Amino acid sequence: INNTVALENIYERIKYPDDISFVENQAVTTKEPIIIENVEDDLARELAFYKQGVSSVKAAFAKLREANVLISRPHDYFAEMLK
Amino acid sequence: ANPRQRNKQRSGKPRLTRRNANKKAKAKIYGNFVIQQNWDKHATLRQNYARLGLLATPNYVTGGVEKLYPDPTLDDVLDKEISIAPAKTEVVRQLEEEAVKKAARQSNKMLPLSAFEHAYIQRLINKYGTEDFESMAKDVKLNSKLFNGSKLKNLYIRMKA
């Protein structure tokens, strides 16, 4: 099993268009792997996830400001919350 | 304690005392007569069966048995015909013979014919013979009840005796 050639072809065929905007794509997949080797422990995993989320948030906020996407939630604009 | 029970203590009427408390009382053997005449009313049914030469269980026993004395293939299991088994005791021998003799007394399973049956089969026989039962069945003028050749054969075979 594990047909690498077939899997790569499927991934390329179903690959999303990278030309989409960062806000539109909403993807923050970077190149530096923020993955703690001690992720089995709760503290190391939480720190690695928080660092990845912080970098993702900063990149998204910068892209949103560049793309004129008002990421700041307005208090006046009331909508049903997820929770 | 209860008011119904004080009702009886405070009344001179006697109780419905019934004296049917017999412990160590074993049940007496009705059913058979040969077994009744060879039953030790003290011994257990296991002991009584074993002494009589019978089996109380055809299966296993779920406990240790009483020891009183220091005693010192498909085609083969399908077409085999076991020739009964010997009768270890005389009581089992007595049961065996009376059953064989009782079969001899009630051994006439064969039936006689009647007036209606005899005339029915005879009338069919005179016209068709005593060997062609298939053609006998296919006749409807004489075989009004519409018996098949197998019921006509039994009538013919039964008429002789």
Binding site: - | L54, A85, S114
Partner: protein, 116 residues
């Protein structure tokens, strides 16, 4: 609530007398019916042989006891069980054959009408 077992020996005795009563009624014939030998249904116990419920219809056909006369001589019939292997068939066909070897069935009175 506590279930107390002070009647453990009074139950033991009552069950013996029920056996004694059952014999007194049908004393020439066994107090229990015969049972087949079946293999328990798991990887843990399939190497044991234990008593089953009744004999299959393939087992009775092969032995020679029709399913109607089987019960009348104390041979239980389990219609649910079947014979997926020949070992179970021949193991229990032989069991019926041995039981019939030792069987003394007492004749019954049969109606014999005078006419035809």
């Amino acid at each position: 609530y506590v279930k107390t077992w002070f009647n453990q020996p009074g139950r033991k005795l009552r069950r013996r007398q029920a056996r004694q009563t059952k014999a007194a009624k049908i004393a020439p014939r066994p107090v229990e019916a015969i049972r087949p030998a079946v293999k328990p249904p798991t990887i843990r116990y399939n190497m044991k042989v234990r008593a089953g419920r009744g004999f299959t219809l393939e087992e009775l056909k092969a032995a020679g006891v029709s399913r109607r006369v089987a019960s009348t001589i104390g041979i239980p019939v389990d219609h649910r069980r079947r014979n997926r292997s020949e070992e179970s068939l021949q193991r229990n066909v032989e069991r019926i054959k041995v039981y019939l070897a030792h069987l003394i069935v007492f004749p019954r009175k049969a109606g014999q009408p005078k006419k035809g």
